[PDB]
Write a protein that binds this ligand. Structure first.
Ligand SMILES: CCCCCCCC/C=C/CCCCCCCC(=O)O[C@@H](COC(=O)CCCCCCCCCCCCCCC)COP(=O)([O-])OCC[N+](C)(C)C
Ligand SMILES: CCCCCCCC/C=C/CCCCCCCC(=O)O[C@@H](COC(=O)CCCCCCCCCCCCCCC)COP(=O)([O-])OCC[N+](C)(C)C
Ligand SMILES: CCCCCCCC/C=C/CCCCCCCC(=O)O[C@@H](COC(=O)CCCCCCCCCCCCCCC)COP(=O)([O-])OCC[N+](C)(C)C
Ligand SMILES: CCCCCCCC/C=C/CCCCCCCC(=O)O[C@@H](COC(=O)CCCCCCCCCCCCCCC)COP(=O)([O-])OCC[N+](C)(C)C
Ligand SMILES: CCCCCCCC/C=C/CCCCCCCC(=O)O[C@@H](COC(=O)CCCCCCCCCCCCCCC)COP(=O)([O-])OCC[N+](C)(C)C
Ligand SMILES: CCCCCCCC/C=C\CCCCCCCC(=O)O[C@@H](COC(=O)CCCCCCCCCCCCCCC)COP(=O)([O-])OCC[N+](C)(C)C
Ligand SMILES: CCCCCCCC/C=C\CCCCCCCC(=O)O[C@@H](COC(=O)CCCCCCCCCCCCCCC)COP(=O)([O-])OCC[N+](C)(C)C
Ligand SMILES: CCCCCCCC/C=C\CCCCCCCC(=O)O[C@@H](COC(=O)CCCCCCCCCCCCCCC)COP(=O)([O-])OCC[N+](C)(C)C
Ligand SMILES: CCCCCCCC/C=C\CCCCCCCC(=O)O[C@@H](COC(=O)CCCCCCCCCCCCCCC)COP(=O)([O-])OCC[N+](C)(C)C
Ligand SMILES: CCCCCCCC/C=C\CCCCCCCC(=O)O[C@@H](COC(=O)CCCCCCCCCCCCCCC)COP(=O)([O-])OCC[N+](C)(C)C
Ligand SMILES: CCCCCCCC/C=C\CCCCCCCC(=O)O[C@@H](COC(=O)CCCCCCCCCCCCCCC)COP(=O)([O-])OCC[N+](C)(C)C
Ligand SMILES: CCCCCCCC/C=C\CCCCCCCC(=O)O[C@@H](COC(=O)CCCCCCCCCCCCCCC)COP(=O)([O-])OCC[N+](C)(C)C
Lengths: 526, 115, 115, 64
């Protein structure tokens, strides 16, 4: 208070390297202004002493384009490592300003403070902004939640959908779904204006476009299986049905030309979606874009089976069989339409990554390690002149140990070995290490992976279904998109219309007298 | 018994029939015509025989013969080993782990459902 | 304290800091600079690093009498000290030991199978 | 604990002129005529606020 009254500057910026670092362990970025330092270090008395001074420019922008409200979003953390004061400093500065000027500025990236909280993945600040309600009468225009009517426990409310619905570009719903840098993207779709907004899109137009994609793709694999199993099994009966090799006016010719038309429409469409989304992470392609590669491989192998047939290379069976086997394993994508069979495909994806790949690495070490040591012990099989042993080579001793694990065949120990006791000692030691140890420890380790991911498999499923809905919404034309629009115009304040969404609720534990509503008559109008 | 059949067995039997009929065509569509040996050259001659030979490999009966009449002997082994990993290693061992959750939940309620 | 395996006394000694000005020479933790939440600090490595003989890092690792030898390597001047040794010279000497021993078992298998 | 034994076995094996090159920490003037060869660890603390006394360098940046 002595230095400010003596004539210090209250707008000086700190533009140094230490005050704007390149790694987060070398300096401390706070917003470069002496207003932003007093708020980012939890000092409510110096903030209130600075805003009353008439020289304090409260809408200044630093070297990054950030203002006072962008700086509080950047230094925010969770509840565990930071108490609550970023949420309380965001409220004090906004109610003192009194307009929408700070909420709608854009920094050098082109982001408002609402959009920046979704890009960086701040959960507690985004929950505060999307449902903010001011009861005090002269400052009610700054809210995004408005009580429409209330009578006893039953009340109704409106949520503002101005910059959170996907009508504009870089919406808050689009940033959360297509974000790969953050990790809590599946805990941010449980917020109350976003959970109801994804439910309304599924009920009107997304559960019907998803059913039509299932019928066009199930009819595609029937007409590829039947033209590859009822093939003319003769080299003298050379013309395959595909590619229209012979014009003979063949009945059911629509089945084998439907394959060529539909296979190119996938390989063109899926070539674009790999071209736009360009990842570098190995973890991203196994978690977001797995089913874009495997629909692209299955469409290439059908097209490449046509050019090798017209050139007559007798290699086309090795590409059609890999198209039928891969095609019926791709039908497991269409299980996200159900909650019961959708959560079951999440647990398959976690067990293969955590438990099966570790088992298959130790098992191949034992199967190829004991396979040489049994094949190197068998003598030459010429004294019986034919078929004295089944462990004659390395490629035969591996096959006889693979058949002993799954439990097929018979066990013969009277081989042509020169050391019959050492042959039994290496064969019993293989049974203990695999049949007793590894195949029973795999069942015990799957009991841990199931017990952990069963508390999260629902919210991972709703993140996967939310991506499918926003893909169908970018596909349909403009005159469909205006018909399938959510919410209605509501006169909120004096000359203000904001296109809100309505959610009803019942509350019993907290009683109060109702002030600050919109309609006196609590019924549904008309 | 009534809770495990509703929650765990019916989900297993839907994924298993998809793999058994999916790999059953792709092995039956690869075997050549059996006229060059004039009798009984392969056991995967038809769709209704290749399904039966994969059902017997899951429960562990019979014998495994890989010297079929296939025109591509390496591609026949690649589709047969991939079937063993997906069912014998993955699905039949994940079923035991998922029954450990259903038993651990309904054992706190199975007395009052009985009364 | 490292030989007998006393966890709470060893945590006190390795990070001891006296703020009172005339007795600041008795500390082993010193605040180098601090600005707001971000701060830096220095940990004394006089008799705990393996430059001398019977160091504190050597007594904890090669001790067989105690049982909590694996809970004593999570202390803050010892956890970072084992990470820096792995990043400079120990992850490369460990990779060369793998290649000299994997090449050894190939040239013993092939001279015993193609006998 | 098992990986910490492997690191200290490789450190007793390499000769002396490698061991001086792979040395950790730097000399820091701690007090009046005292040099102790310390190790540096950074951290961020949010819950406890205080005014900072008893530091070594006034200028908080990395030197050079
Ligand atoms: C199915 C057969 C073909 C598979 C493709 C080709 C095979 C190459 C494999 C490629 C994919 C590897 C994993 C993908 C994602 C990486 C992270 C991960 O989840 O792995 C997990 C385990 O994973 C392992 O431990 C694998 C170790 C054995 C690999 C070789 C055996 C493969 C079988 C073939 C036979 C031998 C092959 C010979 C080559 C040596 C890491 O453990 P986590 O901590 O629980 O995970 C958390 C995620 N995190 C680490 C990112 C935090
Ligand atoms: C999900 C799974 C995905 C990946 C699975 C992919 C592979 C899985 C399946 C693998 C099956 C492999 C067996 C068949 C191979 C063909 C034959 C061959 O090439 O052998 C040749 C060399 O072999 C030798 O001569 C000696 C072997 C030396 C190296 C092996 C040491 C094991 C180390 C392993 C530890 C490191 C690995 C650790 C783990 C990574 C000799 O052949 P032959 O004996 O003369 O055969 C003649 C046949 N005939 C008699 C009828 C004419
Ligand atoms: C045994 C063989 C004959 C069976 C009869 C005929 C078969 C048709 C089946 C009829 C009965 C279906 C269930 C009855 C009760 C419904 C709710 C339920 O409990 O299901 C549960 C799981 O159930 C599934 O997920 C089934 C999915 C696969 C169905 C087809 C495979 C059947 C095997 C035949 C092979 C393919 C057949 C081809 C046809 C596609 C729902 O999951 P939940 O949340 O844990 O349950 C809570 C209850 N709740 C949802 C009400 C809240
Ligand atoms: C608890 C369980 C309750 C329900 C279980 C009930 C069923 C379970 C059991 C089922 C056993 C079925 C096999 C035997 C059927 C008889 C033969 C037949 O009709 O095939 C005919 C058509 O087949 C073809 O020509 C090609 C097949 C095309 C469709 C199959 C694609 C798989 C997709 C599946 C994915 C979708 C399903 C997803 C999951 C629902 C040809 O017959 P054939 O080959 O010429 O035989 C001649 C015989 N002979 C040579 C001796 C003369
Ligand atoms: C519980 C068990 C599980 C572990 C199983 C592990 C597998 C262990 C396998 C054991 C048996 C295999 C070896 C037997 C030898 C056969 C003879 C032969 O022809 O040799 C061939 C071997 O060619 C190969 O390498 C096989 C090709 C498939 C490799 C593994 C599948 C990849 C799975 C990835 C998919 C991941 C799915 C994703 C799921 C997450 C080579 O031919 P040849 O050298 O010329 O031999 C001469 C013989 N002849 C004269 C008649 C021609
Ligand atoms: C009330 C609301 C409903 C109206 C809305 C419909 C209007 C829409 C108008 C135009 C939308 C643009 C069409 C794109 C065509 C490309 C084809 C293609 O590649 O596959 C597409 C087919 O999936 C669909 O898009 C189905 C939607 C309708 C298709 C066209 C109408 C034909 C109706 C004929 C009437 C039939 C009989 C009618 C019976 C009465 C999408 O493929 P995908 O599966 O998404 O991609 C793979 C999955 N992946 C993303 C993971 C990789
Ligand atoms: C390019 C080769 C692919 C073929 C596999 C080769 C094996 C080795 C390669 C990779 C190793 C395999 C590890 C799988 C890792 C992802 C797990 C997963 O997808 O789970 C899925 C279960 O569906 C399955 O994946 C189970 C069936 C196995 C693959 C089908 C084999 C086809 C036959 C082979 C013959 C054809 C040969 C084809 C040409 C070689 C569902 O999981 P999710 O929850 O939906 O996660 C996706 C997230 N997302 C939805 C947002 C995207
Ligand atoms: C079936 C198995 C047989 C064997 C298959 C073998 C392979 C099996 C492979 C995988 C097994 C999984 C099966 C795939 C199912 C996908 C479909 C789906 O997602 O259903 C979903 C919707 O779908 C509907 O039910 C739509 C209604 C049907 C009538 C549509 C009329 C045509 C559209 C008119 C055209 C207009 C004009 C045309 C011109 C433009 C289910 O929805 P829900 O859960 O009930 O909703 C509850 C919402 N809740 C979750 C929030 C609570
Ligand atoms: C005896 C039943 C056998 C299946 C009937 C098959 C023919 C039916 C024809 C018309 C009836 C349309 C209304 C049915 C809607 C629900 C169906 C259902 O209960 O299945 C259940 C299990 O099933 C599955 O999840 C596996 C997928 C295959 C079976 C479902 C097909 C229904 C799709 C319809 C259109 C495809 C038509 C395809 C044409 C061949 C669905 O699980 P759920 O309970 O919905 O889980 C979410 C609900 N929840 C939030 C409350 C938990
Ligand atoms: C730390 C200091 C270490 C210093 C020393 C290090 C050096 C190591 C020293 C010696 C090494 C061991 C002996 C190798 C040389 C003789 C090999 C031999 O003749 O084969 C013998 C078997 O061989 C075995 O008995 C299995 C070898 C493993 C030892 C079993 C201990 C496991 C305990 C598990 C408990 C079960 C125990 C019983 C399991 C059987 C007999 O074979 P044969 O075929 O009968 O003989 C041929 C004659 N005929 C052709 C007419 C028949
Ligand atoms: C994203 C961008 C994608 C763009 C490209 C997309 C396009 C896709 C491109 C090419 C597709 C793959 C090749 C198909 C064409 C050749 C088929 C062929 O000849 O069969 C070959 C086997 O075939 C295999 O090896 C199995 C195919 C699956 C790939 C294995 C990877 C799994 C890793 C698991 C690790 C184990 C790996 C080893 C597993 C064996 C050999 O068969 P053959 O019988 O010996 O030949 C006949 C000669 N004879 C009769 C005299 C013997
Ligand atoms: C930047 C830092 C890197 C420099 C540091 C290296 C300088 C080091 C100089 C001298 C160190 C003394 C060497 C001891 C030799 C004895 C051999 C022996 O018995 O095995 C030893 C080999 O493992 C090693 O020690 C690898 C270290 C390098 C070996 C020598 C350099 C040759 C490089 C040639 C260039 C090749 C091509 C280069 C390509 C460009 C150790 O065996 P072990 O596995 O530990 O014991 C078994 C495990 N157990 C303990 C549980 C029982």
């Amino acid at each position: 208070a002595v230095l400010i009254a003596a004539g210090a500057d209250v707008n000086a910026h700190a533009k140094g390297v230490f005050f704007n670092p390149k790694y987060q362990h070398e300096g401390f970025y706070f917003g470069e202004t002496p207003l932003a330092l007093a708020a980012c270090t939890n000092q409510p008395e110096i903030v209130q002493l600075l805003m009353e001074n008439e020289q304090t420019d409260i809408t200044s922008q630093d070297s990054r384009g950030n203002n006072i409200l962008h700086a509080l979003v950047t230094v925010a953390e969770d509840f565990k490592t930071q108490n609550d004061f970023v949420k309380r400093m965001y409220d004090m500065i906004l109610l003192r300003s009194g307009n929408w000027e700070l909420e709608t500025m854009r920094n050098n990236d082109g982001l408002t403070p609402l959009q920046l909280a979704a890009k960086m993945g701040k959960a507690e600040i985004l929950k505060y902004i999307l449902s903010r309600e001011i009861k005090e009468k002269p400052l009610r225009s700054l809210s995004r939640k408005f009580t429409d009517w209330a009578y006893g426990p039953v009340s109704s409310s409106l949520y503002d959908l101005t910059n959170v619905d996907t009508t504009t570009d870089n919406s808050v719903l689009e940033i959360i779904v297509y974000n790969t840098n953050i990790d809590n993207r599946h805990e941010m779709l449980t917020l109350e204006p976003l959970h109801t907004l994804l439910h309304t899109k599924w009920k009107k137009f997304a559960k019907y476009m998803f059913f039509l994609s299932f019928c066009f793709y199930f009819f595609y694999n029937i007409t590829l299986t039947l033209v590859s199993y009822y093939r003319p099994r003769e080299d003298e009966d050379l013309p395959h049905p595909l590619a229209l090799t012979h014009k003979m006016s063949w009945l059911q010719l629509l089945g084998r030309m439907f394959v060529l038309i539909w296979a190119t429409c996938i390989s063109v469409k899926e070539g674009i979606a790999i071209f736009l989304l360009r990842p570098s992470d190995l973890q991203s392609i196994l978690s977001d874009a797995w089913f874009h590669f495997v629909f692209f491989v299955q469409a290439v192998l059908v097209i490449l089976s046509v050019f090798l047939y017209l050139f007559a290379y007798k290699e086309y069976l090795a590409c059609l069989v890999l198209a039928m086997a891969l095609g019926w394993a791709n039908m497991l994508y269409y299980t996200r339409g159900f909650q019961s069979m959708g959560m079951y495909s999440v647990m398959i994806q976690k067990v293969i990554l955590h438990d099966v790949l570790k088992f298959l690495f130790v098992y191949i070490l034992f199967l190829l390690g004991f396979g040489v040591a049994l094949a190197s012990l068998i003598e030459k099989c010429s004294k019986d002149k034919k078929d004295c042993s089944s462990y004659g080579s390395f490629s035969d001793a591996v096959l006889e140990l693979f058949k002993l694990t799954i439990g097929l065949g018979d066990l013969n120990i009277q081989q042509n070995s020169t050391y019959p006791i050492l042959f039994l000692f290496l064969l019993i030691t293989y049974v203990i290490l695999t049949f007793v140890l590894l195949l029973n420890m795999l069942i015990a380790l799957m009991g841990e992976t199931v017990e952990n991911v069963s508390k999260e498999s629902e919210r991972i499923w709703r993140l996967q279904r939310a991506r499918t809905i926003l893909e169908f919404e970018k596909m349909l034309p403009e005159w469909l998109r205006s018909r399938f629009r959510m919410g209605e115009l509501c006169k909120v304040a004096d000359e203000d219309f904001r296109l809100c969404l309505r959610i009803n609720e019942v509350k019993w534990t907290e009683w109060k007298t109702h002030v600050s509503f919109l309609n006196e008559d609590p019924g549904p109008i008309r």
